[PDB]
């Protein structure tokens, strides 16, 4: 592991020198999810500290259209471009326009090279045989650059990206090294705890609006209040102690049996938002609402951006519970499915997964677009959603993805027939 | 005085709405002194809080060449330009290239209109009869916009700008409104104290490197250490109590009865750099060292930028003391002048100013850049260095600023252009 870092240091040192020796404009382009906003915040601090002024933009997708602007800014003052949480998938277009560019990304690379020509450096873990889907995120990649300047305090934002991208359980590889370094330097403390304690609000509200896990029977202030009163816990306290947690867990297993999902390693970070899980949810909610610059402000610990983030998070959480309660969940033999709204199908399907895969879809043109979600126990028993969603090219469509999460597209009149086929495939995968 | 705010608030509400309704790129341009960097920090926090991404650049002078650049950025994606601590004098060039712009400035305006055309809003307090040299700074103008959003916490950076532009004594007009609003919202507390206690270092170092007041007989660690041990004060302590204060005051006033400003009204602000006087000096030092992004970072309370800022401040103050010893004051008819190094010219001028204006300069390539300072005593008798230094037009350049402090540039005719300035200063006297 010290040897893999030694191979990565060759690329991070070159990136450091490229930034230090550049004196023109610097453009930072990052993504709007939690990992992208955290990357933006790491880069903003690192650049300010090295005396670089910069123009930071947050985009939703690095399309051909987006890259073809930007290239218009190249014509006079050819800036140094730093792409974060994107860039590897689109590297051909970036080479095409001859950007002076640094790419910090963990998406599977199209070109598996760290040095592309004389003007492009690509830092992507897959090039060193690190699995970017489980062992490092974009914010960790930006952090590997920052630590060449000795900015170990920025490790707290790398951890936020680890949570946002669901790479915290298990904690593997470079991610595990990053957390250990942060703990050694005392920027993070690690504490096993119950998930409701991360919110620092009234516990009955923490339970009412939780979606990790979502417990339908408890998903309202009234039912959560009553449940806590019954087992003798003060519903208005803001942290459950050890006695409260034993009583809660003993009682809740009857409404939600997989109570291991209620226990997590909490990360208490050196940041004004001290709970990394809470900061991750805040950045998500702010990014989903288009408040990109507020999200950067939160990473930079601005009081007012944090106050906006708190207000937006709880509106986001209340609205998500409302959306969840409006789902008309329909059951086949081995799956559930539902029709919902274009924006949140996959978000809703992942939250709804309990014992069987969940497939959501929305109708667009004549198209119908599906999002399929499973869990780890489902995969261990033999689920593979990309094989089952591939059957879309049997009904004049297309489908695929990962074993635990896949999509598909299939003409609007084949919905029932496509789902029957998917249901039967999954049934057989699990025997 | 509350009536003059009502007139300003019509321009700050229009600025607020112009920023809110803009969804393209935003360019912020400020200067590198304490007032410009503080304005950059105010605008950075204000813009982020209103969900605006932006590109900030710091220039030392808003030259015609700089304006022609920047203007090339309007060809595709026409940004909204926010000019802070600049733009009012250059207004005709900004109009000429048809920027979408907001101008936040306290220099004497060229056009005395708030609402120039369809595209430009100029917020300049001179237009409402506020004295931009004694009653408000660029920081305070930026803060007047920010308070339209309720961002009262940003008053701490306006206070830093007030100090950096030497408008804290006396504290007048809009600057006094801002300080009292800050104290009312509990973002500042005011405390009368000896100047040397603002540094939180060993007193013999706080004295040796102090330049307000500058005491040449004590401007070394050696003599400062000995002066304190001879009057009963432990020179290694970092804060002076009342007894050591009265002992140091009378000992200093005895041997130097002309000395002034040993007791100041300290401003303790809600900021990681709690002493606004120290924050002012720190921003000046990093700005003079070209560390523009670090200074913004310091305003935004980044721990590492503050660390750099402390290290750079003390290197700078030591460089400054060495240069005050070796500087060569020279007399003419009605000005003093000198040559020196880039980051020291304006500050040495104002430390030395006593009986007549001082103009420093440094040669940077083919050009000489000047810094003229008077006092409020000399503008009382009609100085205005902005009229005096504008005669660089006669020498292939330009000039301007405030009545009490101005600059000028070009070229190798320093001596010829110097004494065309001592001329005006007696026609003005
Ligand atoms: Mn990611
Ligand atoms: Mn100023």
Curated annotation (Swiss-Prot), chain B:
Coiled coil: none annotated. Disulfide bonds: none annotated. It comes from the Archaea. GO terms for biological process: DNA recombination. GO terms for molecular function: nucleic acid binding; single-stranded DNA 5'-3' DNA exonuclease activity. Pfam families: DHHA1. InterPro entries: DHH_sf (IPR038763), DHHA1_dom (IPR003156), SSDNA_exonuclease_RecJ (IPR051673). To M.jannaschii MJ0977. This is Uncharacterized protein MJ0831. It comes from Methanocaldococcus jannaschii (strain ATCC 43067 / DSM 2661 / JAL-1 / JCM 10045 / NBRC 100440).
